[PDB]
């Protein structure tokens, strides 16, 4: 969940701070870079302001990233988190040398969990695969989640087909698939509308089918 959704984002921007929010209750801030023996969480300080209150703590936690680096992160309460309104955070080092002073709009970094319960079956109806899945667990009003299905033909084959699932739909038929080939289906998810923009979730764990002869 965390490590993964951290990974998904670390996929661009070097020494950048990346806050995001999951089920739209708690924002989560983080940044990276392993160095040497003399650091730690208590080495940095994380100050925020839900626009116009006394300042607080996107309050620190160090962890080592599987890639052999270091990650610093932290969260913020729900009721306090009232979306659309900005938030500015100030992040300083040992001594109050500042390394981030950023404004972030909670509503615009919504990051979902991957969908799940993926199920592919042949079509008792032709040369199609029929795909069913379930929305990312514990996600508020599912009815405005749009998905995108991917279709690989596999490392050895090394191919593709992509499909934009209507917002709130969890089914789709996959036509135009070669006979006798092996297809790997995976689905991902983003908040459709309105307002709140964000990022694609990870691809759901995949499911493969071997297609019958032509």
């Amino acid at each position: 969940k965390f490590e993964s959704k951290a990974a998904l984002l670390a996929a661009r921007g070097p020494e950048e701070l990346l806050c995001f929010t999951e089920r739209l209750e708690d924002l989560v801030c983080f940044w990276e870079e392993a160095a040497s023996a003399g650091v730690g969480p208590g080495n940095y300080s994380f100050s925020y302001q839900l626009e116009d209150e006394p300042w607080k703590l996107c309050r620190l936690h160090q962890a080592p990233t599987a890639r052999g680096a270091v990650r610093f992160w932290c969260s913020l309460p729900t009721a306090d988190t009232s979306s659309f309104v900005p938030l500015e955070l100030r992040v300083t080092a040992a001594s109050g040398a500042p390394r981030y002073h950023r404004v972030i709009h909670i509503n615009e970094v919504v990051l979902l969990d991957a969908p799940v319960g993926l199920v592919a079956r042949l079509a008792d109806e032709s040369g199609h695969v029929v795909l069913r899945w379930l929305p990312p667990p514990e996600t508020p009003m599912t009815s405005h989640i749009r998905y995108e299905v991917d279709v690989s033909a596999g490392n050895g084959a090394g191919s593709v087909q992509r499909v934009e699932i209507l917002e709130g739909r969890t089914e789709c038929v996959l036509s135009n698939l070669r006979g006798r080939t092996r297809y790997t289906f995976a689905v991902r998810a983003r908040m459709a509308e309105p307002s709140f923009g964000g990022f694609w979730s990870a691809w759901s764990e995949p499911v493969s089918l071997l297609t019958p002869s032509d």
Partner: antibody
Amino acid sequence: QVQLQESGPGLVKPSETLSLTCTVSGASISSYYWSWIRQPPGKGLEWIGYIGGEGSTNYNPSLKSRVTISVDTSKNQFSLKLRSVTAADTAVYYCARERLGIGDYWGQGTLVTVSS
Amino acid sequence: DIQLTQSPSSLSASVGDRVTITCRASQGIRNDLGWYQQKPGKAPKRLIYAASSLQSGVPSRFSGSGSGTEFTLTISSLQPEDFATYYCLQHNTYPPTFGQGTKVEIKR
């Protein structure tokens, strides 16, 4: 309301100091962060440093060798202290409230010239 | 210190038409910028914050966009009072730094 005014303007003679203070009125200085800013007349602005009800500070590496920012809560004002004055200090000086990178609001503006 | 090189250096537009100002940074700061207005006798006022969010109080004829490395402030309809010198500021990598400072003049 958001208001700020700088005290005791005037003139300064080289390698001396400055006693600019900023009267804050409206919201409580307990919360936000405050900055001063410098500008040689027709040349450009330079940010100098911040300070909160935090006590904490930061100064531009171009003046950290000199600069000191002060904070009195009951007085509800904040002072700039600047020593080793020269002819590279002939500039306009503003106080502002860093809600982000400026402060929504700047202080009226004070001129202070430097010569013999 | 990071360098914010604005352009054009100054300008000359009629009442009405659509002025636009750019601001390039020696290193992408992405989101972390403010546009500012300096009137002659007046302490400077903050039009845009967080690259594109309009400050309260400033006219909606002022807007800003851009990300990372280049930035634009654009005055959708010029006013006579829109006379002033505008500056971009950066607070991505301390210290905060301003731009040269595009002055704009009213063709009349």
